[PDB]
Design an enzyme around this catalytic site. Structure first.
Site, PDB file in Angstrom:
ATOM      1  N   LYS B 211       0.816  -1.205   0.000  1.00  0.00           N
ATOM      2  CA  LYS B 211       0.000   0.000   0.000  1.00  0.00           C
ATOM      3  C   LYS B 211       0.855   1.263   0.000  1.00  0.00           C
ATOM      4  CE  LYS B 211      -4.090   2.212   1.177  1.00  0.00           C
ATOM      5  NZ  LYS B 211      -3.616   3.623   0.986  1.00  0.00           N
ATOM      6  N   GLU B 217      10.513  -5.118   4.048  1.00  0.00           N
ATOM      7  CA  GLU B 217      10.814  -6.446   3.527  1.00  0.00           C
ATOM      8  C   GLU B 217      10.428  -6.581   2.064  1.00  0.00           C
ATOM      9  OE1 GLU B 217       9.963  -8.511   7.871  1.00  0.00           O
ATOM     10  OE2 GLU B 217      10.053  -9.809   6.116  1.00  0.00           O
ATOM     11  N   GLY B 272      -5.209  -5.898   5.293  1.00  0.00           N
ATOM     12  CA  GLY B 272      -4.324  -6.781   4.564  1.00  0.00           C
ATOM     13  C   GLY B 272      -4.786  -8.230   4.632  1.00  0.00           C
ATOM     14  N   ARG B 273      -5.219  -8.640   5.809  1.00  0.00           N
ATOM     15  CA  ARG B 273      -5.634 -10.024   5.991  1.00  0.00           C
ATOM     16  C   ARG B 273      -7.049 -10.293   5.458  1.00  0.00           C
ATOM     17  NH1 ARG B 273      -4.763  -7.548  10.919  1.00  0.00           N
ATOM     18  NH2 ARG B 273      -6.749  -7.124  12.024  1.00  0.00           N
ATOM     19  N   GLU B 358      -4.347 -12.846  13.832  1.00  0.00           N
ATOM     20  CA  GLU B 358      -3.984 -11.429  13.803  1.00  0.00           C
ATOM     21  C   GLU B 358      -5.208 -10.541  14.023  1.00  0.00           C
ATOM     22  OE1 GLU B 358      -2.421  -9.065  10.337  1.00  0.00           O
ATOM     23  OE2 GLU B 358      -0.573  -9.220  11.522  1.00  0.00           O
ATOM     24  N   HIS B 389      -1.714 -38.577   9.329  1.00  0.00           N
ATOM     25  CA  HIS B 389      -0.571 -39.458   9.580  1.00  0.00           C
ATOM     26  C   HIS B 389       0.594 -38.766  10.312  1.00  0.00           C
ATOM     27  CE1 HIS B 389      -2.670 -42.437   7.380  1.00  0.00           C
ATOM     28  NE2 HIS B 389      -2.679 -41.731   6.263  1.00  0.00           N
ATOM     29  N   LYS B 519       9.004  -4.303  15.341  1.00  0.00           N
ATOM     30  CA  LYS B 519       9.521  -3.490  14.247  1.00  0.00           C
ATOM     31  C   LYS B 519      10.449  -2.414  14.792  1.00  0.00           C
ATOM     32  CE  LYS B 519       5.259  -3.550  11.485  1.00  0.00           C
ATOM     33  NZ  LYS B 519       4.345  -2.622  10.735  1.00  0.00           N
TER      34      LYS B 519
END
Lengths: 557, 557
Positions: B211, B217, B272-273, B358, B389, B519
């Site tokens: 955005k 990152e 975002g999520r 979150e 399994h 951060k």
């Protein structure tokens, strides 16, 4: 009352907790002891890299650790360890030895089971693996039309899958010159279909991983692959050039069309979830080479020796185990997060979901009495920084205490941009545990908001939302570089943690009776799904679901 | 005391649980009510497939469900829902609307924020996406040497990555004629490096998702990709044919070398999520085509209406939320397992780790008061039969209660072997919840052991380990087929489940202040890593870790 709960050392631990836990605050502990890191960290020199196990950001004091070591002694950890290494039948519900340590016994010291040293057979299989890998990787081994093998496809479920997959993913930089590796595990047809669509039958080699060679999901997948292969090859004798088995069932392997000289054996004392060190690791050896596979075994062998010869108070797997007992049986934490800051290790946590949870997700003690305490935790995690941007909000500001293991290699396999990426990765690895420990007080947060020019109303509104309670404990495990040897050491370290925990809980870390009921009930349901008749033989839910499935499988969407 | 704990209906719920908890045994509940499946299940016809939400294998009765529904009424779930859909600023800590529902509002009914309809802007971006997709997919869009685009690489973290990855994985069968898609999220240099090693710069299109276009990152990764690109292309003007942006920062996008016409916008009311439905979903549309993207949006829109018009007592997302509240706030379960029996859905649980954790991993209420009850659970899982399994041993025979959602499509995208694989998959899907519910009693296990010919001693020894206590609750969610439309409906269902839980807990499901501290601390550490000098500016652990890193930087292994 189970063994653990009756143990006096455990009772002392519980008592200490009840009377001091209110006083456990990491900021204050670090503020009051400048030697805290030195007293609560272990450095191991494997001669092939160092491992720093920093457990200082845990809710423990010197007394807690002393009491935890005392518990390990009271619970007979060392004696149990010797029983495992000596080949005694410590898998007591199944009357079996537990000898993954034999698989990687590079020293070749005899390990006897029922009067016979197992090492000669361990080494015979390894020798066979080595020869096969050399033939395949060199191009010597030809497909049915005379081409070299470019793709190796492992077909197996559970322990015949997760280990080989996690290790090849982790050691991807060591696979130059090896064929591509593919893992097919789900009975879901999507898995094999989407894999086969990308392969050439002339240059693909399938590895069927099943001890009994009767495992339903695996053999169905195997039979589907064979059918696809023969559609192109036609000749049944061609199967022996494109299929090998990791099994002991000679008759079934031969009947499948595999040449039995290409059946790679393993033994009853190799648990599936501890099997990557055996023949089961063939796809690893094919992908990164047998030399690299031997280094992996050697790394585990080093850790085995570390675990066997180190006083408890400085023994890495024992300390990790003990910290887990403290959080599980005193703090009541249901889970354990594994967060490797390493994209190559993206399937490490998933591997330990089996290794840990299938081992210690138990409730019956050695005496047959039901536990009256918690056993194994739910293991979960994603590698950083991916996980960091998914769920750390909950770790920092939720309502659950979640012990986390943060792991990272100092040296990256890809030192791009003159190390910039790895610098940011390391900074985040460090900062996250620092933040989890330190938090941010109301006082500190208020000062930031004021410095930011927030009005008094906006400030008061936002203030509580900006506070971090901290006091969230972690382990930081830092190692020089993720080489084959170091990965071996790290995996073995967790295997021994899991072992120590099981001994303390008095459960059997090596059986898995909990898988049986589901298998039985599925076999009953299979035939009932065929045809259009209503099923009424189960509880109403199971019936209802089956009937909906029958109604909808004819729907045209 | 927080809102929830002060709520009379919640207190009523708690009293009932205190009084009747031990009256809750699934085996008995089903034996007593032949109509239990009918009373505790929902069937939804979307016109593009059915969804069966079978919540009958849960520890509830009609009274419990009534009380839960009354709790939703008391906590104002319906009014909060209308506030969301009406564009009110329910993200109260940031003062924003929450309008992922506007992104897929196929009806185009006006939704106003501050008096202005958002649909025109939504639709403008969608039209832009459609055109770009047609150009790339048709071969009209060419790289710097005139080649068509064969690979699309999405670079982003968190919500800019997980959704698009999960959906393109889930919808792989619908990607014929689309370019391959790659997802780079980790700052770890391995992620971008191993990706770029497999690509041709001439036919690769990078999508930079951020955005602000200053995300550390993401932008670091983007700049690494650009440097690699330019090493081949040389010409800075060629960046505009190989890089596009999902952002609103025109200035930074232009500076990067991207043509501003190829900046796909989204808004502050898109979390975002909750963003895959916006421009953030560009990679989805590129892979499976814009038509399939619209179907995905349409499915979510369908579920939005169901959530909007259905009485709470029969409202899927609401019931799923309420069952979770029951397990979290009454039974104290820390976790929630999501177990899709579908390999294409292999990243579905991971997606909801962000979406759920979150959102609801929070501890401050609307009034600024700390919660005094649990909030969001730890979400985890792997697809069946893979997870089956791995860790089911612990779910069946461990010491933790773990609510599980089992999901599966009736119709497979790959009906190979005349439906044999899917038959076996379905049988396991069904048997597992049946087993978890039913268990196996001492007497039942004893009869089996006798029949197997075990001696009395051997029998008594093994018996307790063969017992399954059962009474482990599950939801089974079965849908006709996993098409783009159905996936949209499913994801939206969970989005709304999460929303309802958040309202009930009185927390803000739509902010994420929990990410700030890490951060801030990482930024301070970055410059300290440069150089050989010892670091002493932090707590002893952080310092120790840094100094060990500096030491081991110099090791040759």
């Amino acid at each position: 009352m189970a063994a653990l709960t009756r143990d006096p050392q455990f009772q002392k631990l519980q008592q200490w907790y009840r009377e001091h836990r209110s006083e456990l605050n990491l900021r204050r502990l670090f503020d009051a002891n400048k030697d805290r890191f030195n007293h609560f960290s272990l450095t191991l020199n494997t001669n092939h890299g160092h491992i720093l196990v920093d457990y200082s950001k845990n809710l423990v004091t010197e007394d807690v650790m002393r009491m935890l070591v005392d518990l390990a002694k009271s619970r007979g950890v060392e004696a149990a360890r010797e029983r495992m290494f000596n080949g005694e039948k410590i898998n007591y519900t199944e009357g079996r030895a537990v000898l993954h340590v034999a698989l990687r016994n590079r020293s070749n010291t005899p390990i006897l089971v029922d009067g016979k040293d197992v090492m000669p057979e361990v080494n015979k299989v390894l020798d066979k693996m080595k020869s096969f890998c050399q033939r395949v990787r060199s191009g010597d081994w030809k497909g049915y039309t005379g081409k070299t093998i470019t793709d190796v496809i492992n077909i197996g479920i559970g322990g015949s899958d997760l280990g080989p997959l996690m290790v090849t993913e982790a050691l991807k930089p060591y696979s130059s010159g090896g064929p591509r590796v593919w893992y097919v595990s789900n009975i879901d047809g999507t898995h094999i279909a989407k894999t086969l669509a990308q392969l050439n039958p002339e240059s693909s080699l399938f590895i069927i991983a099943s001890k009994t060679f009767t495992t339903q999901e695996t053999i169905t997948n195997a039979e589907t692959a064979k059918e696809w292969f023969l559609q192109a090859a036609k000749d049944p004798s061609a199967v022996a050039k494109h299929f090998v088995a990791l099994s002991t069932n000679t008759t079934k392997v031969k009947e499948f069309g595999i040449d039995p000289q290409n059946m790679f054996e393993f033994w009853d004392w190799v648990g599936g979830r501890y099997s990557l060190w055996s023949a089961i690791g063939l796809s690893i050896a094919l992908h990164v080479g047998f030399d690299n596979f031997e280094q992996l075994l050697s790394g585990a062998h080093w850790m085995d020796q570390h675990f066997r010869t180190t006083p408890l108070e400085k023994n890495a797997p024992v300390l990790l185990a003990l910290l887990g007992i403290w959080y599980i049986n005193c703090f009541g934490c249901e889970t354990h997060a594994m967060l490797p800051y390493d994209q190559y290790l993206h399937r490490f946590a998933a591997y330990f979901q089996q290794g840990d949870m299938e081992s210690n997700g138990k409730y019956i003690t050695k005496s047959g009495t039901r536990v009256d305490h918690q056993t194994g935790p739910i293991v979960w995690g994603e590698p950083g920084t991916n996980g960091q941007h998914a769920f750390y909000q909950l770790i920092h500001q939720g309502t659950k205490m979640i012990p986390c293991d943060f792991l990272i290699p100092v040296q990256t396999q890809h030192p791009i941009r003159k190390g910039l990426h790895h610098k940011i990765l390391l900074a985040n690895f460090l900062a996250q545990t620092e933040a989890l420990m330190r938090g941010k007080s109301t006082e500190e947060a208020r000062k930031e908001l004021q410095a930011a020019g927030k009005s008094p109303e906006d400030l008061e509104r936002l203030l509580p939302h900006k506070v971090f309670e901290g006091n969230r404990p972690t382990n930081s495990i830092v190692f020089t570089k993720l080489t084959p040897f170091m990965l071996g050491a790290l995996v073995a370290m967790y295997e021994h943690k899991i072992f120590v925990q099981g001994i303390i809980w008095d459960i059997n870390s090596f059986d898995q009776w909990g898988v049986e009921l589901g298998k039985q009930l599925a076999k009953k349901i299979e035939p009932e799904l065929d045809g259009s008749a209503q099923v009424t033989s189960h509880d109403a839910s199971t019936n209802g679901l089956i009937n909906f499935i029958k109604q909808q499988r004819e729907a045209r969407v």
